[PDB]
């Protein structure tokens, strides 16, 4: 079990495609699940995601034209109950206490939010929180130095290992953060 976490592509509103090295890494037959925070914002990016894995979950972003996407989603992958939401409904944006408030509502071990366009991955109150950032490194009015980034989760029984992939200049650089369920 390994999950791909990404979102906020904003194609074609703010970008046109993923960076060249991201399209090389993301190829079919290798990832089981994909959880998308939203803002694709069209079928051209949806159909590209459906060919990367069979089970793809997408929530609705603030600029997605498809209403059929739900506002939020709670899905289980192994032992971890995971909640998915774009994060434009979380006021204030990127606020810690407002995110933990939603973790109580969904009753999830891991919560996924994405509006910030800033990668974050950390444990709080013995609960884990992911923000993959903009995989395209799209424009954001509140942050000027966006690093194109996504997240790969390696779930095994009662342990998750999250890999952050970042395009720093031309290179793709990876860091690793691990979380074990209490």
């Amino acid at each position: 079990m390994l999950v791909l976490v990404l979102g906020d592509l904003h194609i074609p509103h703010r970008c046109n495609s993923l960076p060249a090295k991201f399209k090389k890494l993301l190829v079919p037959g290798k990832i089981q699940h994909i959880l998308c925070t939203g803002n694709l914002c069209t079928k051209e990016s949806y159909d590209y995601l459906k060919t990367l894995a069979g089970d793809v979950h997408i929530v609705r972003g603030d600029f997605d034209e498809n209403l059929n996407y739900p506002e939020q989603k709670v899905v289980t992958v192994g032992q971890f109950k995971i909640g998915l939401i774009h994060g434009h409904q979380v006021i204030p944006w990127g606020d810690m206490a407002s995110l933990a408030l939603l973790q109580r509502q969904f009753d999830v071990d891991i919560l996924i939010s994405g509006h910030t366009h800033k990668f974050e991955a950390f444990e709080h109150e013995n609960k884990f929180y992911i923000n993959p950032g903009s995989a395209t490194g799209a424009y954001n009015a509140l942050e000027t130095n966006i690093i194109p980034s996504f997240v790969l989760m390696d779930i095994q029984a009662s342990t998750v290992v999250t890999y952050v992939y970042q395009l720093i200049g031309d290179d793709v650089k990876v860091e690793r953060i691990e979380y074990k369920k209490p």
């Binding site: 390994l2 290798k30 790969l152 390696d154 890999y163 990876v174 690793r176």
Partner: peptide
């Protein structure tokens, strides 16, 4: 060592 790392 990420699982991709191409």
């Amino acid at each position: 060592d990420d699982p991709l790392n191409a």
